[PDB]
Motif scaffolding. Structure first.
Motif, PDB file in Angstrom:
ATOM      1  N   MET A   1       0.875  -1.217   0.000  1.00 27.80           N
ATOM      2  CA  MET A   1       0.000   0.000   0.000  1.00 27.80           C
ATOM      3  C   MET A   1       0.890   1.239   0.000  1.00 27.80           C
ATOM      4  N   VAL A   2       0.438   2.316  -0.658  1.00 24.71           N
ATOM      5  CA  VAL A   2       1.175   3.611  -0.700  1.00 24.71           C
ATOM      6  C   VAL A   2       1.272   4.292   0.680  1.00 24.71           C
ATOM      7  N   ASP A   3       2.512   4.471   1.134  1.00 25.50           N
ATOM      8  CA  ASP A   3       2.869   5.117   2.396  1.00 25.50           C
ATOM      9  C   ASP A   3       2.937   6.634   2.086  1.00 25.50           C
ATOM     10  N   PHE A   4       1.860   7.358   2.439  1.00 19.73           N
ATOM     11  CA  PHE A   4       1.726   8.792   2.126  1.00 19.73           C
ATOM     12  C   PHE A   4       2.932   9.584   2.577  1.00 19.73           C
ATOM     13  N   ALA A   5       3.262   9.495   3.868  1.00 17.20           N
ATOM     14  CA  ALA A   5       4.387  10.253   4.420  1.00 17.20           C
ATOM     15  C   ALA A   5       5.730   9.943   3.738  1.00 17.20           C
ATOM     16  N   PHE A   6       6.017   8.664   3.566  1.00 14.00           N
ATOM     17  CA  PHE A   6       7.246   8.275   2.853  1.00 14.00           C
ATOM     18  C   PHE A   6       7.254   8.751   1.369  1.00 14.00           C
ATOM     19  N   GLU A   7       6.199   8.465   0.622  1.00 13.83           N
ATOM     20  CA  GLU A   7       6.187   8.808  -0.808  1.00 13.83           C
ATOM     21  C   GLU A   7       6.176  10.329  -1.075  1.00 13.83           C
ATOM     22  N   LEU A   8       5.544  11.086  -0.182  1.00  9.91           N
ATOM     23  CA  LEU A   8       5.465  12.533  -0.345  1.00  9.91           C
ATOM     24  C   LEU A   8       6.850  13.147  -0.133  1.00  9.91           C
ATOM     25  N   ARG A   9       7.531  12.704   0.932  1.00  7.02           N
ATOM     26  CA  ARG A   9       8.909  13.123   1.179  1.00  7.02           C
ATOM     27  C   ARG A   9       9.811  12.714  -0.003  1.00  7.02           C
TER      28      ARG A   9
END
Length: 98
Positions: A1-9
Motif C-alpha cells: 500500500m502507498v505510504d503517504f508520508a514516505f512517498e510525499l517526502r
C-alpha cells in the motif's frame, strides 16, 4: 500500500513539488501539476478553488487526513502548509494516490 508520508517526502526530494495555496492554485490553473494535495483544514474557498481548477484540467486532488500543521511537518517545514502540488513525482509512487 502507498505510504503517504514516505512517498510525499520522496517526491519532494527526488522530484519537484510546489507548496502553498497560491502556487498550488497557479499550477492547477496552468495544467502543470500532476496531483494536488490539500490538508483537511485548508480554508473552504481554497479547497473549492483547487478542486475547480483541477477538475478543469483532469488533475487528481487528494485530501490529506491531517491538519496543515501535520502536513507542514511532513514536508520538513516549521509552518503550516494547506496545499501543495506535485509537479514531478521523482522516483516516488505519490501519484498512485490519484
Amino acid at each position: 500500500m502507498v505510504d503517504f508520508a514516505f512517498e510525499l517526502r520522496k517526491a519532494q526530494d527526488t522530484g519537484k513539488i510546489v507548496m502553498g495555496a497560491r502556487k498550488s492554485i497557479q499550477y492547477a490553473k496552468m495544467g502543470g501539476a500532476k496531483l494536488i494535495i490539500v490538508a483537511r483544514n485548508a480554508r473552504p474557498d481554497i479547497k473549492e478553488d483547487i478542486e475547480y481548477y483541477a477538475r478543469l484540467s483532469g488533475i487528481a486532488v487528494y485530501e490529506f487526513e491531517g491538519t496543515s500543521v501535520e502536513l507542514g511537518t511532513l514536508l520538513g517545514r516549521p509552518h503550516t502548509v494547506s496545499a501543495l502540488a506535485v509537479v514531478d513525482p521523482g522516483e516516488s509512487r505519490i501519484l498512485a494516490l490519484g
